[PDB]
Design a protein around this ligand. Structure first.
Ligand SMILES: [Ca+2]
Ligand SMILES: [Ca+2]
Ligand SMILES: [Ca+2]
Ligand SMILES: [Ca+2]
Ligand SMILES: [Ca+2]
Ligand SMILES: [Ca+2]
Length: 579
């Protein structure tokens, strides 16, 4: 920066910049690259506190340690003060970082490592993967000293030495014959006695099993609910509440049929046996569309076989991966795009499972980290869509709703299991050949299909990836996505990620390859996992799209919430409107 004979000498970084005090033009010859000078000035903005010695400045530039407030950090440390795993700053889950290159580009926010662009006083910090914890300072070693920013106190798992373990075996029959003194709901609200007026009135009018033990006030399961035991409470009529227990991790897989012998070879097509749909709900209370659910009028009723229907056969050579293409119009009559009231913003997806009931993920209504809190007049639904940019009045309908029921056991803290939410249509949609509810299978039907070798059909518009993650380069495609996802068995599913595979979830997706990231993070928030049944000639919904692990880290599968256990729960809502 002086000694004009040194102006005959082209400036260097390590020379004029660190040790001397290089100008921006000196720094410029001293780095050439524009991004190099960008990072250079970001550091020097954060590294005036470490200008000298050269070790201080170099350690502040590199960022593999903590200097000053540590916003210059660029190391590998992905562990907070309390030890909660760091959230990737590209993934908006759990806590959506509005802080990126748009707000404070200098901090140069990395893949998963801690970052302090918004100048938190706690030192370098990272969004905690825990939804109950937004940020947290990390154990970032101080530049020039054997000191980390925070003493390492990881969140150790619960100690089993201080907890009294229950030695009761996990209750079968879904708590039908439970005898314990638990007379309060899952979260502690006490259940009324069955001798009370409302509980007795509900037992008299309902088809509650007599063999199921009807105790004074304890929550029971006389209707054969698969979600667990339950009870009614006083207040608004029809209120239902579970009473959580030591329920086993139960899946439809572990039941051995008494009619399907050991002859599993050469899958046999149904011999002129069209299944009579034994209706499970009453048409007066559940509404229309029950009997003829899940049939495309222009495809199955018109005898038109779609291109990718034959691709559901697992007998394909190695089951070659199917890429979702420009779908035919109206192949998904029950999918609904849930937009925000104003402005028109594609927020979530939902399933029109009946003529007056809509199933959507509870995440579409409440998630504390993203600050979403919805009322009745804050959302609109659009049913029968093919392209979002056009309102094709020729097919779709624009609707509002009138009531929404939140699943009581919605626990967003740990794993978003039981991601359940029901909605009632304010304006019933006139029947059409392009709109049709999808059937909800029973346990036996789902078990048969999983044992029938039919691959599922996953529908989505690609909003899942952009909602969960913020990668740039692949905007929203202009056509609907429909893919044939084979069912993944439980072992590879559990081994794929550290998130517990809860009792209400199963697997789906392709098997990933080395270097070739699959399409497991395609779809919409709150979407259904649809499958085809050659045994019933109809389509079924089995899973709800939950938070996918394929969006955060490479090579992950799809994990989705069980829905075939909802039937006994479903009645619990419709009697709230059938009284
Ligand atoms: Ca110089
Ligand atoms: Ca000089
Ligand atoms: Ca000069
Ligand atoms: Ca120079
Ligand atoms: Ca020099
Ligand atoms: Ca030197």
């Amino acid at each position: 920066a002086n000694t004009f004979l040194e102006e005959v000498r082209k400036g260097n970084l390590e020379r004029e910049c660190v040790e001397e005090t290089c100008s921006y033009e000196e720094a410029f010859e001293a780095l050439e690259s524009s991004t190099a000078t960008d990072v250079f000035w970001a550091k020097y903005t954060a590294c005036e506190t470490a200008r000298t010695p050269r070790d201080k400045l170099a350690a502040c530039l590199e960022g593999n340690c903590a200097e000053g407030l540590g916003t210059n950090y660029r190391g590998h440390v992905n562990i907070t003060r309390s030890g909660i795993e760091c959230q990737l700053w590209r993934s908006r889950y759990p806590h959506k970082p509005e802080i990126n290159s748009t707000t404070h580009p200098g901090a140069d926010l990395q893949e998963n490592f801690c970052r302090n662009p918004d100048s938190s006083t706690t030192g370098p910090w990272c969004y905690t993967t825990d939804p109950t914890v937004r940020r947290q300072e990390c154990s970032i070693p101080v530049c020039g000293q054997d000191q980390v920013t925070v003493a390492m106190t990881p969140r150790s798992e619960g100690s089993s030495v201080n907890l009294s373990p229950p030695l009761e075996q996990c209750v079968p029959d879904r708590g039908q014959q439970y005898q314990g003194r638990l007379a309060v709901t899952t979260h502690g609200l006490p259940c009324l006695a069955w001798a009370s007026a409302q509980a007795k009135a509900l037992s008299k009018h309902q088809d509650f099993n007599s063999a199921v033990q009807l105790v004074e006030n304890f929550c029971r399961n006389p209707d054969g609910d698969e979600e667990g035991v339950w009870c009614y409470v006083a207040g608004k009529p029809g209120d239902f509440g579970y009473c959580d227990l030591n329920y086993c991790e139960e899946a439809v897989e572990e039941e051995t049929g008494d009619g399907l012998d050991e002859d599993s070879d050469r899958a046999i097509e149904g011999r002129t046996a069209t299944s009579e749909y034994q209706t499970f709900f009453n048409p007066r209370t559940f509404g229309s569309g029950e009997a003829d659910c899940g049939l495309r009028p222009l495809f199955e009723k018109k005898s038109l076989e779609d291109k990718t229907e034959r691709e559901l056969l697992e007998s394909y050579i190695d089951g070659r991966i199917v890429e979702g293409s420009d779908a035919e119009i109206g192949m998904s009559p029950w999918q609904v795009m849930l937009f925000r009231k104003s402005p028109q913003e594609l927020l979530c997806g939902a399933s029109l499972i009946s003529d007056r009931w809509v199933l959507t993920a509870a995440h579409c209504l409440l998630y504390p980290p993203w600050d979403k809190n919805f009322t009745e007049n804050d959302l609109l639904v659009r049913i029968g869509k093919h392209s979002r940019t056009r309102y094709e009045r020729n097919i779709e309908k624009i609707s509002m709703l009138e009531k929404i029921y939140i699943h009581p056991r919605y626990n967003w803290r740990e794993n978003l299991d039981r991601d359940i939410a029901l909605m009632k249509l304010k304006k019933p949609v006139a029947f059409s050949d392009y709109i049709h509810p999808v059937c909800l299978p029973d346990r036996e039907t789902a078990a048969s299909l999983l044992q029938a070798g039919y691959k599922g059909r996953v529908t989505g518009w690609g909003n899942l990836k952009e909602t969960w993650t913020a990668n740039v380069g692949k905007g929203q495609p202009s056509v609907l996505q429909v893919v044939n996802l084979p069912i993944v068995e439980r072992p590879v599913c559990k081994d794929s990620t550290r998130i517990r595979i809860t009792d209400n979830m199963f697997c789906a997706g392709y098997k990933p390859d080395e270097g070739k990231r699959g399409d497991a993070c395609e779809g919409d928030s709150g979407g259904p996992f649809v499958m085809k049944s050659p045994f019933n000639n109809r389509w079924y919904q089995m899973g709800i799209v939950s938070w996918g692990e394929g969006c955060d880290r490479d090579g992950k599968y799809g994990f989705y919430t069980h829905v075939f256990r909802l039937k006994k729960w479903i009645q619990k809502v419709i009697d709230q409107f059938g009284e």
